[PDB]
Design a protein around this nucleic acid. Structure first.
Ligand SMILES: [Mn+2]
Ligand SMILES: [Mn+2]
Ligand SMILES: [Mn+2]
Ligand SMILES: [Mn+2]
Ligand SMILES: [Mn+2]
Ligand SMILES: [Mn+2]
Ligand SMILES: [Mn+2]
Ligand SMILES: [Mn+2]
Ligand SMILES: [Mn+2]
Ligand SMILES: [Mn+2]
Ligand SMILES: [Mn+2]
Ligand SMILES: [Mn+2]
Ligand SMILES: [Mn+2]
Lengths: 87, 94, 98, 107, 98, 82, 106, 94
DNA sequence: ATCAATATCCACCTGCAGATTCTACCAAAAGTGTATTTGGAAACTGCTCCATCAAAAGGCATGTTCAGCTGAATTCAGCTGAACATGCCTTTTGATGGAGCAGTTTCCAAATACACTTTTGGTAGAATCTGCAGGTGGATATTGAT
DNA sequence: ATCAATATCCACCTGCAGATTCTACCAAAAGTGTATTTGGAAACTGCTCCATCAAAAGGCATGTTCAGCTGAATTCAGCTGAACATGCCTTTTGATGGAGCAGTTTCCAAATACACTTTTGGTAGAATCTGCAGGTGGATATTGAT
């Protein structure tokens, strides 16, 4: 296997309009300019926590592929039970 | 390997309540998660209950108490009647 | 040239998105963020496509519900504009930072 | 012969539920009435959620229940909302709800 | 006639109660309340003494932590006086109301 | 002079709780609000405790019934067994 | 015969932990190392809290650890506080803490 | 009927860490609650891990993963090293 | 800035509720020894589906302009809560019959254990059905300037 | 209150992905039938420790006074929403190699299953031991009026 591009700064892929949309679904009408970076930071923590546990389940099973079930179990452990993906 | 799901039973019940209504596969997946979720919750409450009382057997009585602990008011009442009825009937048939 | 007043379109957007269910973050960008984060935890991982969608459904539900709480915090302060301090108070009361 | 489900008057599988209870390591022993009672409860809760979701589907002029209908059913029902208070229904969206102070005008 | 200004003694009490651990609701009245509530679920019940005490330790720790969140909500609205709407906001975000 | 039981949770007791919670100034309406909140808290915990009491075929609510009730409500308490 | 605890170099009871695991209905079987590993983890966590609790008793000029000290040790320690984030230590009280805006304007 | 607790073992550990420090009854009861609580969380997590992977056995490996899932950073690292050390020592002994 | 009223410390003191030390008893455990049973690792491999490259294009992200109206500041007065002094009723404490929580013994309804026999939920593959996404057009509200 | 610029409602209609429609195969279920085992209901009962009463004991209820907090009214700088031009990059449709997940068989290292010997933690009673909770004394800080 040759090369594999370096992943960096992808938190910026969570754009201002996407965050605005999520806040609209949450019933928000007006948004301070500082909210976007704050939301990215909160999403990163949320994702690090769920992904850490999901990958822990992946390693325990000695797999190299993170499954939908590894995520469902990780979400359940965190009190964020998710229906619809085998869980 | 065969993978089980409550799908056909969910479908049978769907047909009883809403004869001409169908369900998408994603909604059926959600219903299968729901049934498994409640099964585990009730079974786990039953397990703890039996352990707390130093009993090695989970009987319908532990399921009933687990149901009362787990379900909100009116749902617990109706679940209790349906389960009691199902057991009384079951035991009358043999 | 016609112009809706500020807030009018915002309210329209709220009604539109609260009526629908499609994910609101672009899919590939979210998938890259997931891969970047996962990669820093453990190298050479692969992902089932439904594992990434599961993370996205959960992340968006989490954020929408946090914005609802944030909104309540801004309104509590007699504002209609959410600010970082509202998100922080919401997470603190939730026990996410408490 | 007859299934334990038929003897109990249920649609849900008593045999399956008995098996799942044994394999789950909930207790050393599982009595015969346990799976009957449990299958009955699961069946009842599923009847309840499908009753409400099919109504949400009808309300939306649809014949097929989708996740959004399951979510509207659960979130608009006080008890199901509580039972699923920490559950996320994928592709469910949220209930329309705009805080009053955010609406325009007055009165 | 000496007189401490409004707040001076309040602050003094906060310092005092945050240093100690004794229960702050009187026992008998709490016990009566507990028995009365239980009688609605099952009549003619008795209580081990440790059962009532556990309920009081749990109830007090619950209210004290709720008052902390309530206080953050009042402060969020630029007040220093807790009001019912502060307790309501805290409970809603905790998901006890939500 | 009579006295409603929940009223036995007095203004001073509530203020002390609030002080330990870091509260400096209190609205008069807080006391009744607090009583209502405390009653809901006790109803939820006691209901489950009694459910464990009855399942055990007892007439006495034990500390363990309370500990198990608190635990399932996500309010784990240390110091009373379990 | 040497106790499994002594063989593992532990103070906590391996034998009892094995027994508790078996009867807790956690799995059909329990391997030999599981109760040893688990006992060691329980011992270590215990030492950690008693270590910090004892220090709190000391700072308070006390030689006997009481609930207050366990609470001070746990709530002042970032990790223990999170591990016990949903636990109430009876007779623990709270950490001294007054929101700055509430202090008088000296 | 015997009432078992971790009291005597908690006390032995106390003496190793603070030789001249005692512990009150209430505090000890808190420590007993702590040990039972962590035991149950770790055991339950290990139980789920084995079931998820369709294994009938809870081995030191499920205990280890359970620890990494349940304990915060540094606590997990030291618990893992302490656990690994004890199983090593144990395994090397006639 | 100057007392003056109080709260807050700290050094010391000691009775006692609660922790510690010790003897005796033993079912409960836990450890050792023996033989059988078995979960799941390695080994080999079928086959799903994951990563990746390609190409096309339009749904959206980006960046800017402009100004509506929101947040933040300032001011101020009504009035609600804090502090406090005044007086008694509910709570706390210590003592005592029994309601039952438990320990013990008896016994069967009911739950493993085990060998067949029969039924059924999956599911692999091909075929036809059918609800509604998605675009279209036009009559009906909604908004916002005047 | 009229009028235009636009969003919103929505019933109707076509193409299609997703769904309900059958055929055949069946291992994994689930069920029917004897033998053997035993968990725990049931009854009786001893020992706690709970409910309740009496009285020694330590807040709470209540009205007065006013400090200072809340929230109303006012003002305005500039943030943030709305609209717009531009074109990037996500999305969509497909194909392909192959990493690796997952099925199948072999087979031992390690676990279950007693049976037996030993040690040990828990309990009960007796009696001595001790950390520290309050109580005292005097010193000093804190607070608030002057
Ligand atoms: Mn990286
Ligand atoms: Mn095998
Ligand atoms: Mn661009
Ligand atoms: Mn404003
Ligand atoms: Mn007043
Ligand atoms: Mn009796
Ligand atoms: Mn079939
Ligand atoms: Mn449409
Ligand atoms: Mn028996
Ligand atoms: Mn390969
Ligand atoms: Mn001994
Ligand atoms: Mn002292
Ligand atoms: Mn003095």
């Amino acid at each position: 296997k040759r090369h594999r591009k370096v992943l960096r700064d992808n938190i910026q892929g969570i754009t201002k309009p996407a965050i605005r949309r999520l806040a609209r679904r949450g019933g928000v009408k007006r948004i301070s300019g500082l909210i976007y970076e704050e939301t990215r930071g909160v999403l990163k923590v949320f994702l690090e926590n769920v992904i850490r546990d999901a990958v822990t389940y992946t390693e325990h099973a000695k797999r190299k592929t993170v499954t939908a079930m590894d995520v469902v179990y990780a979400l359940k452990r965190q009190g964020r039970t998710l229906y619809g993906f085998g869980g | 390997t065969r993978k089980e799901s409550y799908a056909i039973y969910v479908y049978k019940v769907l047909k009883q309540v809403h004869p001409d209504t169908g369900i998408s596969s994603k909604a059926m997946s959600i219903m299968n998660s729901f049934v498994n979720d409640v099964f585990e919750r009730i079974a786990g409450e039953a397990s703890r209950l039996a352990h707390y009382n130093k009993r090695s057997t989970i009987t319908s009585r532990e399921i009933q108490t687990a149901v009362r602990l787990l379900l909100p008011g009116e749902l617990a009442k109706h679940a209790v009647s349906e389960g009691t009825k199902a057991v009384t009937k079951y035991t009358s048939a043999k | 040239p016609h112009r809706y007043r500020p807030g009018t379109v915002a309210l329209r957007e709220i009604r539109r998105y609260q009526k629908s269910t499609e994910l609101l973050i672009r899919k590939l960008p979210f998938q890259r963020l997931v891969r970047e984060i996962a990669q820093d935890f453990k190298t050479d991982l692969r992902f089932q496509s439904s594992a990434v969608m599961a993370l996205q459904e959960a992340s968006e539900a989490y954020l929408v519900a946090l914005f609802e709480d944030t909104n309540l915090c801004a309104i509590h302060a007699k504002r209609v504009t959410i600010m970082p301090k509202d998100i922080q108070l919401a997470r603190r009361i939730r026990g996410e930072r408490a | 012969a007859k299934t334990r489900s038929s003897r109990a008057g249920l649609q849900f599988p008593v045999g399956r539920v008995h098996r799942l209870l044994r394999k789950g390591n909930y207790a050393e022993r599982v009595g015969a009435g346990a799976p009957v009672y449990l299958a009955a409860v699961l069946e009842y809760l599923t009847a309840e959620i499908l009753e409400l979701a099919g109504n949400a589907a009808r309300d939306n002029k649809k014949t097929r229940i989708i996740p959004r209908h399951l979510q509207l059913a659960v979130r608009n029902d006080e008890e199901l909302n509580k039972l699923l208070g920490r559950v996320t229904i994928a592709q469910g969206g949220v209930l329309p709800n705009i805080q009053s102070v955010l609406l325009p005008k007055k009165t």
